[PDB]
Amino acid sequence: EYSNQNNFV
């Protein structure tokens, strides 16, 4: 299982 999230302001 592979889970990913990213934010760029």
Curated annotation (Swiss-Prot):
The glycosylation pattern (the amount of mono-, di- and non-glycosylated forms or glycoforms) seems to differ in normal and CJD prion. It comes from the Eukaryota. It is found in: Cell membrane; Golgi apparatus. Belongs to the prion family. Its primary physiological function is unclear. May play a role in neuronal development and synaptic plasticity. May be required for neuronal myelin sheath maintenance. May promote myelin homeostasis through acting as an agonist for ADGRG6 receptor. May play a role in iron uptake and iron homeostasis. Soluble oligomers are toxic to cultured neuroblastoma cells and induce apoptosis (in vitro). Association with GPC1 (via its heparan sulfate chains) targets PRNP to lipid rafts. Also provides Cu(2+) or Zn(2+) for the ascorbate-mediated GPC1 deaminase degradation of its heparan sulfate side chains. The normal, monomeric form, PRPN(C), has a mainly alpha-helical structure. Misfolding of this form produces a disease-associated, protease-resistant form, PRPN (Sc), accompanied by a large increase of the beta-sheet content and formation of amyloid fibrils. These fibrils consist of a cross-beta spine, formed by a steric zipper of superposed beta-strands. Disease mutations may favor intermolecular contacts via short beta strands, and may thereby trigger oligomerization. Contains an N-terminal region composed of octamer repeats. At low copper concentrations, the sidechains of His residues from three or four repeats contribute to the binding of a single copper ion. Alternatively, a copper ion can be bound by interaction with the sidechain and backbone amide nitrogen of a single His residue. The observed copper binding stoichiometry suggests that two repeat regions cooperate to stabilize the binding of a single copper ion. At higher copper concentrations, each octamer can bind one copper ion by interactions with the His sidechain and Gly backbone atoms. Monomer and homodimer. Has a tendency to aggregate into amyloid fibrils containing a cross-beta spine, formed by a steric zipper of superposed beta-strands. Soluble oligomers may represent an intermediate stage on the path to fibril formation. Copper binding may promote oligomerization. Interacts with GRB2, APP, ERI3/PRNPIP and SYN1. Mislocalized cytosolically exposed PrP interacts with MGRN1; this interaction alters MGRN1 subcellular location and causes lysosomal enlargement. Interacts with KIAA1191. Interacts with ADGRG6. This protein is produced by a bicistronic gene which also produces the alternative prion protein/AltPrP (AC F7VJQ1) from an overlapping reading frame. The alternative prion protein/AltPrP (AC F7VJQ1) and PRNP have no apparent direct functional relation since a mutation that removes the start codon of the AltPrP has no apparent effect on the biology of PRNP. In mouse and hamster, the alternative initiation AUG codon is absent and is replaced by a GUG codon. It is linked to PrP is found in high quantity in the brain of humans and animals infected with neurodegenerative diseases known as transmissible spongiform encephalopathies or prion diseases, like: Creutzfeldt-Jakob disease (CJD), fatal familial insomnia (FFI), Gerstmann-Straussler disease (GSD), Huntington disease-like type 1 (HDL1) and kuru in humans; scrapie in sheep and goat; bovine spongiform encephalopathy (BSE) in cattle; transmissible mink encephalopathy (TME); chronic wasting disease (CWD) of mule deer and elk; feline spongiform encephalopathy (FSE) in cats and exotic ungulate encephalopathy (EUE) in nyala and greater kudu. This is Major prion protein. It comes from Homo sapiens (Human).
